[PDB]
Design a protein around this ligand. Structure first.
Ligand SMILES: [Mg+2]
Ligand SMILES: [Mg+2]
Ligand SMILES: [Mg+2]
Length: 80
């Protein structure tokens, strides 16, 4: 099945990181506005996870690495 397909980066809720820290990380790493970053942060906190970015597999590998360096629990998967 064709592997040339889009992927997403997902951030998972963690019990240590501050909600204010998560909002800041999404702004700093992705350039998102505050309303956007806060909405994503709250989605992680209230649903347990959220898609935070989307693109090619190789581009999502970078976003995962960036988020891990910031201390956030990030994974990637194919978007169906
Ligand atoms: Mg929470
Ligand atoms: Mg996290
Ligand atoms: Mg999807």
């Amino acid at each position: 099945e064709s592997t040339e397909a889009p992927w997403v980066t997902i951030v998972w809720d963690d019990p240590v990181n501050l909600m204010s820290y998560v909002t800041y990380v999404f702004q700093k790493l992705f350039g998102y506005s505050e309303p956007h970053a806060t909405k994503l942060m709250l989605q992680v906190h209230n649903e347990g996870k959220a898609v935070v970015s989307a693109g090619s597999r190789e581009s999502m590998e970078v976003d995962v690495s960036k988020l891990h360096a910031a201390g956030l629990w990030a994974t990637m998967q194919q978007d169906r």
